[PDB]
């Protein structure tokens, strides 16, 4: 009851009465006594002493406040910070938050490559105007790259960073290349040998057949994947030998699978998996796809596909003296059993360099060709379209961006509703003062916002909104906020039904009267503002009392009244069977109760 | 349809889902009652794991003393646990480890431990889980029994003015020779006080008294100073450092052997790590250690061992009787079970007669073993000595081993160039381990290729090292103040995040859970809530007088403002500049009737 | 309410399969003239106390 001990003179000198409001507080004492002491008690000024004593903690707080938070990224492993390493970088994720150093180049590289990917994707919407629409997008896309407002017609060239998108977009500019290739996300390069294209068939489901191409001669290449080097030689649709110098399980597995597809080694180039027969669609929405990229996509779905591909490659039992250079199904460095024609080692394979620049030729499918075929890039080796916010950017030509969403639609509708006010005749305040609400049910803006409304039960929403509007107008008690909130629903015809307390749009969102919400929120002392997803909007007018009267914006045929606990709690349905002079409590939100009376 | 929760282990790993196998951390509801049956079984299995039959009646008690050390017999069925230790091999392994690490290694460590102890205040002993009072004959925190002991010394032979560990130890020693001792009132004789001091109670984790406490602390300090320099010692700390040790070991291994060898890992689990550790071997080992150092430490380190060689064990609550219909039920203590042995069942009888010799009044004179969770550092040192073994018989065959060992859990790494010599190496290792009592289980110890193993719940794999040691606080059991228990929980969560046992979303969920636990503990809620509790009454009226609701304290209808990047920062420091100056000065008023020093404490 | 009551009565009376414990409950509402509206399921008096036609409650069981 009074477990907490205390002092005696300290109590009377502070004049702490027991049972202040039936709370004893107490030598011994209760816990509420601390509440009573910190809410009504002596006043000191000792802040400086506390800060000086706790300088270390408050300096840590200051340092924390001295941070410029940066982005985070999921990845792996190939003092003042020790206080925060827990929140700075784990093992699967990491945050690049910095303190004093600033250098915006690699972020600029990521941005430019992302936007290049974006634009090259945007050009994939027709069948004939590929290059034209591409180049026009480029010329119509400017950026505040870094600190300089530059255009996207010189950065692609001035930059030196090999990539499928950089090359795919620069070839149209007759720009220089570096003899590099791109088979999917992997990066390849030639070392020696050469050959010519040759065609062969492959079955699907055991009955059909499809043609693919490959090379028949011997040729060595330099593959490369994330944290994984390699070297290998392809010969007659099959992989002869291969070596690796980057030790990681997943990286090595995926790199090996990609190099195998590049060599088309394996029986799945004779027949196909039973998973492909599920689709047999080596085609885009309206375009064609080879077999290699289809196989790759089948790999991306699950690692079981990768394991199946690797089993297709012969597995054998390792002999002595080779464990150190063997491999395993799961990328294990050494194992009693390994795969045929493999070699693991340590140290990344030094990559060669080609100092010979060239220019390629784009095709209908934008596939670039340097010579003897030998595709260097394409859209097929790109990720799926990924929406990402672009800043420091200008994109003017049509197809720049849809810029059309239900949220933005609602935002624009409400902006129009707000501007319509216009402090003039034939606008919201004139019709209000005139008590002509019917015209409000015919305005253009409500007609533009109507499509965003839930169609199945729009009649009841319109009925309720038309009830609130009339009941607030006729009497003269109203609030512009709730009105504008419910207006978009006062367009269709009223009907009978069951209302719950929320107005639902077509995007599964909703709105509710007498409460605030992300889509629409407002509060007194700032009534000149209206938040929409946090976006503060302004009112072309000023009001100090037009909003203070919300007694009719909560329910339809009721009015708020003085609080009374005796009144019984009810729901929104039983309201129909109430009478007059009969108060009733009811929830108006989360833990928000209010009393109401009919009329 | 049939819901089989386990089919997600096929197309996925195990390091990602193993956590779903064990319940969430907390105080278990199992509550096993240490009572006469289990303790007697423990003592029996102890005397049995001793494979000898020799004895020597003492002169201080007139009781036999099973000496199970350096007298191995009954070699048959050696698979089962053994406890007979050989001193020669022990000292040989110690010499190997010394040679490896260095000559003045043990000397440097013991010197550091000494100097650290010198400036130590005996009051430190108040920091302990629990102990056993030798006057009230019960279990309590350390501070209570310490106050009892000091006030008894005062009442009997004047106060203790040492204010240091060494004077405390010497006072205990002298008290071992006092004939009469008093305490609030009653007194006792020499033999009874000796027994009480050498008594232990089952909490069957041990719960020793206070006399031996400081010597155990000294020995543990030394063993700790030693385990730090050892690469294969994951006891003193865990997590980041533990993973560092793991990967260092693995990489050194990979860089050590050749292309012709092929490695293997083993997940081992020592069984009966408490019923096979003997303090006599520990004493000989400590002697060999301090051999070249101040005789002070030589004598000091030789205290706790002998104190454990003679340890009376308090038998739990005695058995009960009953008639057929159970309408009547008698209750008897342990000391009198030897008086009604003719009634108890056989299984309970055959477990009591062979030990009646060692009983004195109500306890059993256990002459060895190690039941407490003590000397864990020392046992770990002994294990590391076991792992640092190497000879020429192995070198000739081109094989060796290495690994890591916790208190009673370890991980082995064997090396060879044949699928058979590995077995020979494993058997050699098991033999050398059993030579000194360190055994291993067969139904709980497995092994496989190097990629996969486990250690202290940290399931290592080729990648994706997963931990499972997620700890949490508990307010109801440990209630201190409304300004410390939240900051401590934030620090705990931060730590758990450091050890990778927690992730951002997981940490946030745990935070929002602990906040609610805190509130419900101290019976506090926010102001937005429509509660009617006592503390809320006043808060329901003195709330409108403030505007900086954000600055309010959680203990006073406040709301949270800390997050992941603001854990080290207490909410107070985070709301100081925001609290309405009135409330601020009303809290930080040193002129009140009562880490951050608030006006929220519960003395 | 009057409408509903009269309806029930006719349905019970026209055939002969009636329950005497329901007419005695619903009759007091048949005095007025029928009208149109949504019957929620309850029959209220002027004192916020209702009876339901078919289930027993504190007011009529």
Q: Give the integer Cα–Cα distance in Å for B339 and B316.
A: 17
CB A80 within 8 A of CB A63: yes
Output the furthest CA–CA distance in chain B (Å, rounded).
86
- Residues of B whose CB is below 8 A from A83: 568
Distances (CA, A) of B4 to B1, B16, B477: 10, 18, 38
Q: Report resolution in angstroms.
A: 3.8
Helices (H), B36-122: 36-49, 87-101, 105-118
Chains B and C touch (3+ CB pairs under 8 A): no
* Beta bridge pairs of residue A505: A453
Q: Give the integer Cα–Cα distance in Å for A47 and B23.
A: 46
The size of chain A, in residues, is 599
Listed residue (A150, A129, A152) closest to A140, CA to CA:
A152
- Contact state of B592 with A42 under an 8 Å Cβ cutoff: yes
The pairing of beta strand A218-221 with beta strand A231-235: antiparallel
CB B325 within 8 A of CB B306: no
Closest residue on chain A to C38 (Cα):
A576
Tracing tokens 């793991």 back to the chain, one arrives at B246
* Strands of B225-359, DSSP E: 264-269, 311-314
Sign of the torsion formed by the C-alpha atoms of A365, A371, A374 and A378: negative
Q: How many CB atoms lie within 10 A of CB B122?
A: 20
Q: Give the integer Cα–Cα distance in Å for A54 and B434.
A: 55
Closest residue on chain C to A497 (Cα):
C38
Listed residue (B435, B341, B355, B268) closest to B46, CA to CA:
B355
- Residues of B whose CB is below 8 A from A7: 593-594
Chain A interface, best mutation among B261, B420, B593, B600, by max A CB count within 10 A: B593
Which residues lie closer than 8 Å to B277 by C-beta, 6 or more apart? B369, B370, B375, B379, B437
- Contact state of A576 with C40 under an 8 Å Cβ cutoff: yes
Q: Give the integer Cα–Cα distance in Å for A159 and A115.
A: 14
* Beta bridge pairs of residue A89: A94
Listed residue (B299, B329, B332) closest to B318, CA to CA:
B332
The pairing of beta strand A224-225 with beta strand A228-229: antiparallel
- Secondary structure (3-state) at B236: coil
The size of chain B, in residues, is 603
The single-letter DSSP state of residue A350 is P
Q: Reading across the β-sheet that carries B363-366, which strands appear in turn?
A: B199-200, B311-314, B363-366
- Contact state of A324 with B260 under an 8 Å Cβ cutoff: yes
Q: Report the phi/psi class of residue B428: left, alpha or beta, with left for phi > 0 and alpha for psi in -120 to 50.
A: alpha
CB burial class (10 A; 0-12, 13-18, 19+) of residue B358? buried
A520: its two tokens: 């629409």
The pairing of beta strand A190-193 with beta strand B131-132: unpaired
- Secondary structure (3-state) at A101: coil
The torsion angle over the Cα atoms of residues A91, A95, A100 and A104, rounded to 10 degrees, is 120
Distances (CA, A) of B389 to A150, A231, A465, B100, B104: 69, 43, 87, 10, 20
The size of chain C, in residues, is 61
Q: What are phi and psi of A466, to 5 degrees?
A: -70, -30
* Strands of A297-355, DSSP E: 315-317, 337-339
CB A46 within 8 A of CB B590: yes
CB B197 within 8 A of CB B115: no
- Secondary structure (3-state) at A428: helix
Tracing tokens 């790259």 back to the chain, one arrives at A145
CB A571 within 8 A of CB A496: no
Which are the residues after which chain A is interrupted (C to N > 2.5 Å)? 26, 78
- Secondary structure (3-state) at A150: strand
Output the furthest CA–CA distance in chain C (Å, rounded).
35
The torsion angle over the Cα atoms of residues B480, B481, B482 and B484, rounded to 10 degrees, is -80
- Residues of A whose CB is below 8 A from B584: 47
Q: Give the integer Cα–Cα distance in Å for A169 and A172.
A: 6
CB B169 within 8 A of CB B214: yes
List residues of chain A with CB under 8 Å from any CB of chain C.
Answer: 496, 568, 573-574, 576-577, 579, 582
User: In Å, how far is A45's CA from the nearest CA of chain B?
Assistant: 6
The single-letter DSSP state of residue A352 is P
Q: What are phi and psi of B172, to 5 degrees?
A: -55, -50
Which residues lie closer than 8 Å to A511 by C-beta, 6 or more apart? A485, A486, A502, A503, A505, A517, A519, A520
Among partner residues A496, A577, A582, which is closest to C40 by beta-carbon distance?
A: A577
Q: Give the integer Cα–Cα distance in Å for C37 and A122.
A: 58
A127 and chain B in contact, CB less than 8 A: no
Q: Give the integer Cα–Cα distance in Å for B602 and B481.
A: 6
CB B239 within 8 A of CB B500: yes
The single-letter DSSP state of residue A569 is B
Q: Give the integer Cα–Cα distance in Å for A328 and A336.
A: 9
Q: Give the integer Cα–Cα distance in Å for A421 and A418.
A: 6
The pairing of beta strand A93-95 with beta strand B363-366: unpaired
Q: Give the integer Cα–Cα distance in Å for B509 and B538.
A: 31
Listed residue (B526, B519, B510) closest to B564, CA to CA:
B510
CB A25 within 8 A of CB A36: yes
User: In Å, how far is A569's CA from the nearest CA of chain C?
Assistant: 13
- Contact state of A331 with B259 under an 8 Å Cβ cutoff: no
Break chain C down into helix, strand, coil percent, rounded to 5: 40, 5, 55
Which method, experimentally, gave rise to this model? cryo-EM
A517-555 b/e with 16+ CB inside 10 Å = b?
Answer: eebbbbeeeebbebbbeeeeeebeeeeeebbeebbbbbb
The single-letter DSSP state of residue B258 is -
CB C31 within 8 A of CB C2: yes
Q: Give the integer Cα–Cα distance in Å for B593 and A10.
A: 5
Chains C and A touch (3+ CB pairs under 8 A): yes
CA A386 to mean position of chain CA atoms: 9
Distances (CA, A) of A7 to A12, B586, B588, B591, B593: 9, 17, 17, 11, 5
Q: What are phi and psi of C16, to 5 degrees?
A: 130, -10
Q: Give the integer Cα–Cα distance in Å for A331 and A313.
A: 14
- Residues of C whose CB is below 8 A from A582: 48
- Residues of B whose CB is below 8 A from A591: 528-530
Q: Give the integer Cα–Cα distance in Å for A266 and A313.
A: 6
Q: Give the integer Cα–Cα distance in Å for A495 and A370.
A: 69
Question: Within 13 Å, how many C-alpha atoms sit on residue A338's CB side?
Answer: 20
Tracing tokens 């992989």 back to the chain, one arrives at A239
User: In Å, how far is B429's CA from the nearest CA of chain A?
Assistant: 24
CB B362 within 8 A of CB B335: yes
A434-468 b/e with 16+ CB inside 10 Å = b?
Answer: eeebeebbebebbebbbebbbeebbbbbbbbbbbb
* Beta bridge pairs of residue A316: A338
CB A177 within 8 A of CB A358: yes
* Beta bridge pairs of residue A202: A210
Which residues lie closer than 8 Å to B379 by C-beta, 6 or more apart? B273, B277, B370, B407, B408
């Amino acid at each position: 009851k009074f477990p907490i001990i205390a002092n005696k003179r300290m109590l009377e000198e502070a004049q702490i009465p027991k049972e202040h409001n039936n709370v004893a507080l107490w030598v011994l004492a209760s816990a509420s006594c601390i509440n009573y002491w910190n809410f009504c008690g002596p006043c000191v000024n000792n802040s400086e002493v506390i800060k000086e004593v706790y300088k270390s903690r408050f300096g840590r707080l200051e340092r924390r406040k001295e941070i410029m938070w940066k982005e985070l990224r999921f990845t792996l492993v190939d003092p003042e910070r020790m206080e925060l390493i827990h929140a700075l970088g784990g093992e699967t994720w990491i945050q690049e938050a910095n303190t004093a150093g600033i250098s915006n180049v690699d972020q600029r590289k990521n941005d430019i490559r992302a936007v290049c990917r974006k634009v090259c994707l945007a050009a994939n919407a027709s069948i004939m105007n590929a290059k034209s629409k591409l180049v026009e997008y480029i010329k119509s896309t400017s950026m505040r790259i870094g600190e300089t407002e530059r255009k996207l017609e010189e950065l692609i060239l001035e930059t030196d960073d090999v990539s499928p998108e950089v090359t795919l977009c620069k070839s149209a500019l007759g720009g220089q290349l570096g003899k590099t290739l791109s088979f999917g996300p992997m990066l390849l390069k030639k070392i020696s040998g050469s050959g010519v294209k040759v065609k062969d068939t492959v079955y699907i489901q055991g009955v059909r057949a499809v043609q693919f191409e490959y090379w028949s001669e011997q040729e060595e290449f330099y593959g490369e994947y994330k944290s994984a080097t390699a070297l290998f030689s392809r010969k007659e649709r099959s992989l002869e030998w291969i070596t690796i110098g980057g030790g990681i399980n997943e990286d090595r597995k995926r790199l090996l699978a990609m190099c195998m597809i590049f060599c088309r080694d394996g029986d799945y180039f004779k027949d196909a998996p039973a998973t492909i027969t599920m689709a047999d669609l080596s085609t885009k929405l309206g375009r064609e796809i080879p077999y290699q990229y289809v196989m790759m996509n089948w790999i991306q779905k699950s690692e079981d596909n990768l394991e199946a591909l690797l089993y297709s490659r012969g597995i054998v039992e390792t002999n002595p003296g080779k464990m150190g250079s063997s491999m395993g199904i799961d990328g294990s460095k050494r194992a009693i059993k390994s795969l045929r024609a493999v070699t693991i080692q340590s140290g990344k394979i030094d990559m060669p360099e080609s100092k010979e620049k060239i220019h390629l030729e784009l095709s209908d499918n934008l596939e670039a060709f340097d010579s003897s075929g030998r595709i260097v890039a394409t859209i097929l080796d790109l990720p799926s379209d990924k929406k990402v916010t672009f800043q420091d950017v200008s994109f003017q030509h049509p197809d720049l961006a849809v810029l059309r969403d239900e949220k933005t639609a609602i935002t624009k509708g409400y902006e129009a509703l707000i501007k319509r006010l216009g402090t003039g005749d034939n606008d919201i305040p004139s019709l209000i003062a005139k008590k002509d609400y019917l015209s409000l049910y015919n305005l253009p803006e409500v007609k533009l916002m109507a499509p965003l409304i839930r169609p199945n039960r729009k009649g009841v929403y319109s009925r309720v909104a038309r009830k609130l509007v009339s009941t607030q107008v006729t009497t003269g008690h109203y609030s512009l906020h709730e009105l504008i909130k419910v207006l978009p629903f006062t367009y269709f015809a009223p009907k009978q039904g069951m209302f719950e307390g929320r107005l639902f749009f077509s995007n599964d969102s909703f709105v509710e009267p007498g409460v605030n919400n992300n889509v629409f929120s407002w509060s007194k002392a700032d009534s000149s503002k209206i938040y929409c997803h946090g976006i503060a909007i302004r009112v072309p007018l000023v009001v100090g009392d037009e909003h203070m009267d919300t007694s009719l914006a909560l329910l339809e045929g009721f009015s708020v009244c003085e609080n009374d606990p005796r009144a019984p709690m009810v729901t929104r349905q039983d309201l129909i069977d109430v009478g007059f002079g009969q108060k009733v409590r009811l929830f108006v939100g989360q833990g928000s109760v209010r009393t109401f009376k009919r009329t | 349809m049939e819901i089989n929760p386990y089919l997600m282990f096929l197309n996925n790993d195990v390091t990602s889902l193993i956590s779903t196998t064990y319940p969430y951390t907390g105080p278990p509801p199992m509550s096993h009652g240490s009572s006469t049956k289990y303790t007697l079984e423990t003592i029996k299995r102890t005397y049995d794991y001793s494979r000898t039959s020799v004895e020597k009646t003492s002169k201080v008690f007139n009781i036999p003393r099973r000496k199970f050390c350096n007298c191995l017999e009954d070699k048959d069925e050696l698979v089962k646990p053994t406890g007979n230790v050989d001193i020669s091999s022990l000292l040989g392994l110690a010499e190997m480890m010394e040679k490896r690490m260095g000559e003045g290694f043990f000397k440097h460590c013991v010197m550091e431990a000494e100097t650290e102890i010198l400036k130590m205040h005996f009051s430190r002993l108040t920091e302990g889980r629990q102990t056993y009072d030798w006057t009230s004959e019960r279990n309590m925190p350390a501070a209570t029994a310490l106050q009892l002991t000091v006030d008894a010394i005062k009442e009997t032979e004047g106060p203790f003015k040492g204010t240091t560990m060494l004077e405390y130890c010497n006072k205990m020693i002298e008290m071992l020779d006092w004939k009469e001792i008093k305490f609030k009132i009653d007194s006792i004789k020499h033999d009874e006080f000796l027994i009480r001091a050498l008594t232990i109670n089952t909490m069957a984790i041990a719960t020793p008294g206070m006399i031996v406490r400081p010597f155990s602390k000294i020995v543990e300090t030394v063993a700790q100073k030693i385990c730090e320099k050892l690469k294969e010692s994951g006891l003193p700390v865990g997590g980041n450092e533990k993973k560092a040790k793991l990967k260092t070991t693995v990489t050194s291994l990979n860089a050590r052997m050749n292309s012709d060898q092929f490695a293997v890992n083993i997940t081992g689990d020592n069984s009966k790590w408490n019923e096979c550790q003997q303090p006599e071997a520990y004493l000989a080992l400590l002697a060999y250690i301090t051999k070249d150092s101040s005789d002070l430490m030589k004598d000091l380190c030789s205290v706790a061992p002998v104190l454990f060689c003679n340890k009376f064990v308090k038998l739990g609550q005695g058995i009960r009787l009953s008639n057929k219909r159970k309408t009547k039920e008698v209750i008897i203590k342990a000391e009198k079970m030897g008086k009604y042995k003719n009634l108890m069942r056989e299984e309970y009888k055959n477990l009591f007669e062979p030990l009646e010799k060692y009983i004195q009044k109500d306890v059993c004179f256990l002459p060895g073993g190690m039941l407490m969770g003590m000397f864990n550092m020392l046992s770990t040192v002994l294990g590391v000595s076991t792992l640092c073994y190497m000879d020429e018989e192995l070198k000739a065959k081109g094989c060796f081993w290495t690994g890591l060992q916790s208190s009673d859990d370890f991980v082995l790494f064997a090396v060879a160039s044949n699928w058979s010599n590995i077995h020979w190496t494993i058997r050699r290792f098991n033999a050398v381990c059993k030579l000194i009592g360190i055994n291993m289980s067969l139904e709980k110890s497995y092994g496989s290729l190097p990629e996969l193993f486990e250690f202290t719940s940290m399931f290592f794999d080729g990648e994706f090292v997963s931990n499972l040691a997620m700890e949490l606080p508990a307010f109801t059991t440990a209630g201190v103040n409304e300004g410390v228990d939240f900051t401590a929980a934030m620090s705990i969560i931060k730590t758990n995040m450091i050890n990778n046992s927690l992730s951002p979303s997981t940490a946030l969920m745990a935070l929002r859970i602990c906040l609610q636990e805190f509130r419900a503990t101290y019976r506090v809620h926010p102001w937005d809530s429509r509660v009617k509790g006592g503390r809320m009454k006043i808060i329901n009226e003195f709330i409108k007088t403030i505007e900086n609701k954000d600055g309010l304290l959680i203990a006073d209808g406040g709301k949270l403002m800390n997050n992941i990047s603001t854990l080290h920062i207490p909410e107070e420091v985070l709301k100081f500049e925001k609290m309405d100056e009135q409330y601020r000065n009303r809290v930080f008023n040193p002129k009140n009737p009562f880490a951050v020093v608030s006006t929220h404490s519960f003395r």
